[PDB]
């Protein structure tokens, strides 16, 4: 009866198969009952988008809005404007929402959403009118206390804006329907480096655990891939912190260090009017002696060509880290992987890493952290958004980044004793962070969902 | 694409593409070709998770789905339908086709249909009770009298359509017309059992004028019906008030022919009926002795050809029940007229022989041949009065609903009609394609009212 | 003091209470005074920003505004008018005068006004299509079907109104009767088209039946019209319908009077119709040989004094088209019944002519005037029954829209009579004014309602 | 077409005009375009409000809300209840609001609305009856994420309590719908001292730009008008910042200071008795020593009365201080002055102190800062009050005034730094607040504007 949805079939049963590997269906056998109902959405909305293209001629393309979660909160996700999607993907990105939202210890739930509207080609004309038909339908549907989305995929400030405006025109409320937000209608401070600071964030614990407090990011080689705000930001606080940034990387290639120790800041500034007004990271060789600093390698990764590293932060594209990428990095000396990007790591990387943690003991063996813990530096934000918001406020950036901090520590902390009571490692083992993150955003989802009788 | 393959759905945006296609319409308005593009994309589709319990007491999940295809003729109007094999490929399938075969009726009515994979078979009446709830309160929001008016099918019928009321009215505190299929005493119509078959028969009558110029009726008439159901029933019932001769019945295991110059009487209908509740045939009514004479029993058999000399043929028992040879001897035996109150009841070929026939002789010496989707709207232009007469606050005479059930299935008749003079213009004294007209009227409203609308331009 | 100079509203609340002063109302009735204090402020006004792109891709800015004047005896009911003329004051001059206007049908209706600046001059149907969306997008939130049923005007036709109702659609999600002016398959009503000729036509009917007491009827009668257009095309066809003998039409640059002894066929005038579609002139038809004889064309001439005698007037084609001299030709050819068709159509002179005539002679001997407010009322009350059958859940036929429409036109005539007779009572055997009446009668019906309502004491 | 609305219209010309003179529409050419759109409300509401007298007749008057603009946050504004009222002047009023409100760096738009309802003669009866009848009709319109109204003349506290007892009547709801609220139910601390302190805290960072920080409110002679909360406030913090102040003024006349150098705060706190239970400020004088201290000059504005002033604070009423008071101003030694009155000084005043700017250098200036930057402290703290009610608590004293301190220090910069980049003086020259103002309030909300779309 049912459809084929290979990507959200793909994530249950990657999901369900951590749970059975692990004691809580021992301790919490009824929680199986949990996950039939967890695994269905609450709602979906799929709906057509009517819109205008600059020749004046009829264009016609689909909307949806998968509302997953709100067990724990306000349905919270993302709209992705990309000619791939449909329903079994947003149920996908959808489905991992809930338990990433949750791990971030704030009341949200989990939902996704977006178009099949191509913003490649388009004016920004076309892409106002598309937001303006599209949020016509959606608007009903969502809202400040009910589905808070955001930006993704094909959806930026830019789109952020369209939309917002045509919700308060449709509404005629002022109010945190959308996070993602400018300056000066309701946007949080941190939002750009929100991600890239929270895995770094992540790291520092995975390291202070890992090494007893032996070491820090200082004096680290840390491979970075990526030049947005993501690997910007990730990149400056490692450089705060004392650690070396051996690498970045764009579309058309990465960029190594090898005259130098690590990037400068300031080559990471130079990086960034590299990304504005186009131009690409290549730009950057050629020119101010950093010829002699940098290897560029046109068309290939920086996974392998930056030698003996000891910290991997995919911050680009999905599936990114490929099985040979995870097998170089263990041979290089890495110890430690978490994802700046979304889904970066590939099934296969993390099997690789994850056997690596189970044969080798202690401080040896390379930690993989997923992205429902690792990446939700950004959610979490999209989260303090809404709450400033709320108390009508504008925080500084030391009250967003404050908080960020003490999210992230959270965050670690609950995979790290999830899974030392559910998937208890053996002597001098580390402790699996996705297991352990995988059961903790599923245990208080279900329970919740338990606590307001959703199942039973 | 990106798309999921629906196969139900797009077996149908096509078939409905080689209509337009090969009729004369995109040449007339080239345009009209946006229009199927944007049409066939639903407005809004729900659906949602229903969680609901056993009489274990356990937890129990099934999906819900309402599918809101087209309002630009009217609120969304459809069906429910619970089956285990229900999906949105299968409700957009049925919904696409339910916007223009509404639209036909020339009831402002838009075209829907939701529904569940709950399973009705061997569930209890608490479980049916406690599913229709947990279901209507989330399909709640999303309609109303005047947004979305749902209806019965395969698994919901007057029993959770009860349940499906009662839970509504309780959470919106509103009582409106939210269903139809409702009880006489909470805002049903008369004329509900019979609006399918008094539909059919009040369609031929339309076809009968036509054709004769108006010279005539159904008096006199020798009509086979085929089957022994809701149909059957009051289809016959129909032909006997307008002075017709209702000639055979059909069953599963068996089929019933008159003694011939003859007709069966409103009792031995009535006794047809008795013999289907009891769950018994319709031998077991020549095995009376009051019956025994005046009725043939020919088991494994199908009317078509055992009935002698005929008028009016009316299949109304199950789909593909009138093969290419059927339609000849129909044909040979100067049947007329020969509408669906059954789905596909005629195949291909039969369609081809009667259309040929149509084609190769002129005027009311052709068979004439309607399709179920116009033959058998009645039900649909009942649900339409159920809701004005609830609008109205009134509860309109048998009489009166039955007459405006008349005048609902000419507009069917004359909206085919029409079409097929405008877009498959026939050859100088043969009578339009009813089929084609059927098939095509329902797009051209829809896509001009959504012109007018500004949904394409 | 401080209130902003609005001229064509106040030019109007000084009209009207001129009218009610030198009646006897405000001696029966002293305390009425304190409900045209309260009435002529609107219940509510709504203008908004309205933010459109054309066809270069450019931000447009207009206003749009929603004068929701009165609800008393039922919704808003009005109609959007753009024009680059329009503002405040315009619309609270014609919703002013909607309430009343409305209020003579007998139907339940409020009233109340809009539009915008928008100059549809030069537009393209996208450009339209784009405002009209960007416009309803606003009101949507203050109309709906209770509240407030808009319709169209000056730059607001049947193309507007179609993407209107469909943006109002898609943000509502709810399918109601939110305007009037709608398409046949998506909820208009049939005989808008001839709402206001047949209602004036429909008036005089009433008006002989009274002065005649019941003892004539339009069979016969002589009727001069004037226009050519929507109003005197209809008009004249009821005449026809009626047995009476359409004896005139007119243009701008000429007129068009009969052979005498005869009447306009429905084919001549069918052949009007064609000749103002395709931009060309009355003329055109003497041009043919079939109707070179049987007609005779004057350039540059108004019917009233070419015609010879004649019962009925009914100017249909601009204002102030007739003057003292041609009301006293009337007179002196026997004319006895003269409505307008038009708006102010004739003179205040020709209005002094006729209402003399009355005073001076008793009983159907007596030229009868009627003024446009109520004989032209017809477009108004088939809105109402656009309504009447959205709610229905129902198309009504021709001849079923027709009555109904004959009733609202008995309605308006009766509420003045019965007006004039309390609050200007005649002299007896003299004719009750229906200038007057008419002009009394929709306050007197509205300023009773809000007593009972309690919106003054 | 359009009618003729001139208070409206003068602000609209007077605001342009600002623009042009400056280098904003070169570097921002497309801006115009916003200009063009800002300047017509969102929406307007006009309304018969029908109420009773106590004689028991049947009453009539207009209602009107202004809705302005919404870009960066619900309708923010006020009520106005005055028989002069109508859309011209609550467009006039309305449209300051907007910028105002924007300069304030909270999320509030801006509108306005009011009756020509006149309060005087009519009782507490009446009124109630009144605010009753009105907020019937105003409710639907309005709300705590819509629109939230306040007082104004004609409306106060007594006014705002009866509007919002009807609202919450209506609704069946407590929210922030409403600012100017009493202490028990939703009111904040600093409400009555907001725009006194916000003044002389605006001008506190106006002398230490202007003079480098050599000189404070410290023995400065400081002349204000107006003996309400607004003067008395912005009296006491000259005071306690080590200021003196040499003048009060009521309706009815002045008070000038002579024998000894400033109020003290009891002189100050004994006019606050003088204005409860009505009395005037004359009274005191003629009684406990104040004989000797002070001058009374009935009939007259102190402007010309003070005798060489350093600080000007007129906060009495519109248009009280004309051309002549600015000259005499400047002739008497005033080099800083900022209104606690909304729009208490003249255009002719204005154009006088922004000469006398232009042609003399440094410190020897005059500085004017508009209304829409240094009288922006009440509608700030009601910014505060929409804040509190949200977060569901009452903030301390110190919470409040530490905020409009920031909130305060804020403006001052956007305008000084705004009118250094598009009216970049000459050397030496100060800045122009009105010009640096007024710009930074039309591009915080055209800019919004356009993320939002409502523009291109
Ligand atoms: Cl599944
Ligand atoms: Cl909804
Ligand atoms: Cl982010
Ligand atoms: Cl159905
Ligand atoms: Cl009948
Ligand atoms: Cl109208
Ligand atoms: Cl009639
Ligand atoms: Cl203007
Ligand atoms: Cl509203
Ligand atoms: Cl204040």
Same mark, same amino acid.
Request: with cysteine; net charge negative.
């Given at each position: 009866?049912?459809?084929?949805?290979? /990507?959200?079939?793909?994530?249950?049963? /990657?999901?369900?198969?951590?749970? #059975?590997?692990?004691?809580?269906?021992?301790?919490?056998?009824?929680?199986?009952?949990?996950?039939?109902? *967890?695994?269905?959405?609450?709602?979906?909305?799929?709906?057509?988008? *009517? @819109?205008?293209?600059?020749?004046?001629? *009829?264009?016609?393309?689909?909307? +949806?809005? !998968?509302?997953?979660?709100?067990?724990?909160?306000?349905?919270?996700?993302?709209?992705? +404007?990309?000619?791939?999607?449909?329903?079994?993907?947003?149920?996908?990105?959808?489905?991992?929402?809930?338990? %990433?939202?949750?791990?971030?210890?704030?009341?949200?739930?989990?939902?996704?959403?977006?178009?099949?509207? $191509?913003?490649?080609?388009?004016?920004?004309?076309?892409?106002?009118?598309?937001?303006?038909? +599209?949020?016509?339908?959606?608007?009903?549907?969502?809202?400040?206390?009910?589905?808070?989305?955001?930006?993704?995929?094909?959806?930026?400030?830019? #789109?952020? &804006?369209?939309?917002?405006?045509?919700?308060?025109?449709?509404?005629?409320? @002022?109010?945190?329907?959308?996070?993602?937000? &400018?300056?000066?209608?309701?946007?949080?401070?941190?939002?750009? /480096?929100?991600? &890239?600071?929270? !895995?770094?964030?992540?790291? /520092?614990?995975?390291?202070?655990?890992?090494?007893?407090?032996?070491?820090?990011?200082?004096?680290?080689? !840390?491979?970075?891939?990526?030049?947005?705000?993501?690997?910007?930001?990730?990149?400056? =606080?490692?450089?705060?912190?004392?650690?070396?940034? !051996?690498?970045?990387?764009?579309?058309?290639?990465?960029?190594?260090? =090898?005259?130098?120790?690590?990037?400068?800041?300031?080559?990471?500034?130079?990086?960034?009017?590299?990304?504005?007004?186009? %131009?690409?990271?290549? #730009?950057?060789?050629? $020119?101010?002696?950093?010829?002699?600093? +940098?290897?560029?390698?046109?068309?290939?990764?920086? @996974?392998?060509?930056?030698?003996?590293?000891?910290?991997?932060?995919?911050?680009?594209?999905?599936?990114?880290?490929?099985? #040979?990428?995870?097998?170089?990095?263990?041979?290089?000396?890495? =110890?430690?992987?978490?994802?700046?990007?979304?889904?970066?790591?590939?099934?296969?990387?993390?099997?690789?890493?994850?056997?690596?943690?189970?044969?080798?003991?202690?401080?040896?063996?390379?930690?993989?952290?997923?992205?429902?813990?690792?990446?939700?530096?950004?959610?979490?934000?999209?989260?303090?958004?809404?709450?400033?918001?709320?108390?009508?406020?504008?925080?500084?950036?030391?009250?967003?980044?404050?908080?960020?901090?003490?999210?992230?520590?959270?965050?670690?902390?609950?995979?790290?004793?999830?899974?030392?009571?559910?998937?208890?490692?053996?002597?001098?083992?580390?402790?699996?962070?996705?297991?352990?993150?995988?059961?903790? &955003?599923?245990?208080? *989802?279900?329970?919740?969902? =338990? $606590?307001?009788?959703?199942?039973?």
């Amino acid at each position: 009866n049912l459809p084929v949805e290979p /990507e959200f079939e793909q994530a249950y049963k /990657e999901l369900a198969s951590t749970l #059975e590997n692990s004691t809580l269906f021992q301790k919490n056998p009824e929680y199986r009952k949990a996950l039939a109902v *967890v695994s269905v959405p609450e709602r979906v909305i799929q709906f057509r988008v *009517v @819109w205008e293209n600059d020749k004046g001629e *009829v264009q016609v393309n689909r909307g +949806f809005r !998968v509302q997953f979660n709100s067990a724990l909160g306000p349905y919270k996700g993302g709209l992705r +404007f990309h000619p791939s999607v449909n329903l079994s993907i947003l149920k996908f990105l959808g489905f991992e929402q809930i338990f %990433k939202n949750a791990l971030t210890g704030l009341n949200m739930g989990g939902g996704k959403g977006g178009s099949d509207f $191509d913003p490649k080609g388009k004016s920004d004309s076309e892409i106002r009118r598309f937001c303006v038909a +599209f949020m016509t339908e959606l608007c009903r549907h969502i809202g400040a206390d009910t589905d808070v989305p955001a930006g993704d995929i094909g959806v930026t400030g830019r #789109e952020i &804006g369209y939309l917002f405006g045509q919700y308060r025109k449709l509404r005629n409320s @002022w109010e945190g329907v959308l996070t993602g937000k &400018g300056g000066s209608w309701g946007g949080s401070l941190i939002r750009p /480096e929100a991600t &890239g600071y929270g !895995v770094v964030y992540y790291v /520092e614990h995975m390291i202070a655990h890992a090494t007893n407090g032996a070491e820090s990011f200082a004096g680290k080689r !840390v491979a970075i891939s990526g030049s947005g705000n993501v690997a910007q930001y990730a990149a400056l =606080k490692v450089i705060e912190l004392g650690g070396r940034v !051996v690498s970045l990387s764009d579309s058309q290639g990465s960029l190594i260090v =090898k005259d130098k120790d690590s990037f400068t800041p300031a080559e990471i500034d130079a990086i960034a009017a590299l990304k504005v007004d186009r %131009k690409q990271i290549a #730009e950057l060789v050629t $020119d101010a002696a950093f010829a002699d600093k +940098f290897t560029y390698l046109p068309g290939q990764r920086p @996974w392998v060509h930056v030698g003996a590293v000891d910290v991997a932060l995919p911050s680009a594209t999905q599936n990114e880290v490929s099985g #040979e990428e995870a097998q170089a990095l263990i041979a290089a000396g890495c =110890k430690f992987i978490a994802e700046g990007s979304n889904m970066g790591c590939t099934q296969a990387a993390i099997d690789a890493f994850e056997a690596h943690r189970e044969a080798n003991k202690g401080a040896a063996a390379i930690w993989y952290a997923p992205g429902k813990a690792a990446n939700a530096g950004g959610v979490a934000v999209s989260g303090l958004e809404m709450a400033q918001n709320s108390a009508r406020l504008s925080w500084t950036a030391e009250e967003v980044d404050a908080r960020l901090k003490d999210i992230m520590k959270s965050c670690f902390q609950n995979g790290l004793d999830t899974a030392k009571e559910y998937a208890t490692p053996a002597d001098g083992i580390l402790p699996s962070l996705v297991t352990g993150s995988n059961i903790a &955003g599923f245990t208080k *989802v279900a329970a919740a969902m =338990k $606590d307001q009788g959703d199942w039973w």
